[PDB]
Amino acid sequence: MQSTVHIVGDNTGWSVPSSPNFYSQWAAGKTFRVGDSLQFNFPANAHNVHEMETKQSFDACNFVNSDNDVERTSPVIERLDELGMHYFVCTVGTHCSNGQKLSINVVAAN
Amino acid sequence: MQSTVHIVGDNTGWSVPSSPNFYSQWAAGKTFRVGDSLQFNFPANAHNVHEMETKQSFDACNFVNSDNDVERTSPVIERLDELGMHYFVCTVGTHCSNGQKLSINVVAAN
Ligand SMILES: [Cu+2]
Ligand SMILES: [Cu+2]
Predict the structure, then answer these.
(1) I want to staple A47 with a disulfide (CB 3.0 to 4.6 A). Which of A42, B73, B76, B89 is the partner?
(2) Is B76 in contact with B40 (CB distance < 8 Å)?
(3) Chain A CA closest to residue B73
(4) Closest chain B residue to A5 measured between Cα atoms?
(5) Closest-approaching ligand to the CA atom of B40
(6) Long-range contacts (CB closer than 8 Å, 24 or more residues apart) made by A46-49
(7) Does A5 contact B77 at a Cβ distance shorter than 8 Å?
(8) What is the spatial distance between Cα B84 and Cα B103, in angstroms, rounded to a whole number?
(9) What is the CATH number for A3?
(10) B63 near B100, Cβ under 8 Å?
């Protein structure tokens, strides 16, 4: 049994959405298990993908512990290695405040 | 411009090859740039993917600084983040000595 590579936002990919609830509706339709990966597809240089530690920072789009940026190449494929809540955002400009952020709950595979 | 996700061994995937030179011929037909990723597809639980630090360890299949194992889920997708030589092996049994190892040279994207 192969693990799944989920395509964030399906055909829409990773961008600033028209409705702020876009990625949380997308995540609620899937089940994510340890071993799966998340693929973020976007036009190079326009966005990025950063994982945040805590819900508070994710909620506030506060990137003080975030990494200066650097890599904006796509696709970015992140492995889901640990159980529990994971938070990813785009740190460009106001994109996170405009809804380009995704929180998912990872469960075991067995 | 999207980065490439290369499929290690193309349709063959990641397994112990019939000829020991299999993965080095596969790697010599491609160009790998920072930002691309390598996807290793194999039957769960049968192999794994581990990156080694030095050529000497890779050459000898010496896994003394290697990580106990743990995750054998597939696919494993590794991002190529740094320039220069990268070495990956399967640490199960005698697979590395039997040719299940891959060394690639990563160049810049610009
Ligand atoms: Cu963005
Ligand atoms: Cu193996």
Answers:
(1) A42
(2) yes
(3) A35
(4) B75
(5) 2
(6) A46/A15, A46/A72, A46/A92, A47/A14, A47/A15, A47/A16, A47/A72, A47/A74, A47/A90, A47/A92, A47/A95, A47/A100, A48/A72, A48/A76, A48/A90, A48/A91, A48/A92, A49/A14, A49/A76, A49/A78, A49/A88, A49/A89, A49/A90
(7) yes
(8) 10
(9) 2.60.40.420
(10) no
Collect all residues of chain A within an 8 Å Cβ-Cβ radius of residue B5: 75, 77
Residue reference for tokens 């010599």: B28
Q: What is the DSSP letter of A95?
A: T
Quote the domain boundaries for residue A68.
1-110
Calculate the alpha carbon distances from A70 to A37, A66, A91 in Å.
22, 11, 11
Place of tokens 């080095």: B24
Resolution (A): 1.6
> Which letter does DSSP use for residue A10 in this model?
G
Give the Cα separation of A76 and A102 in Å (integer): 14
Beta carbons within 10 angstroms of residue B37's beta carbon? 20
Select from A34, A37, A73 the Cβ nearest to the Cβ of B3. A73
Ligand nearest to the CA of B43: 2
d(CA B77, CA B80): 10
Cβ–Cβ under 8 Å, residues A50 and A90: yes
Number of structural domains found in chain B:
1
Residue type, position B3, single letter: S
Residue type, position A110, single letter: N
Query: What is the distance between the alpha carbons of residues A73 and B3, in angstroms, rounded to a whole number?
Result: 7
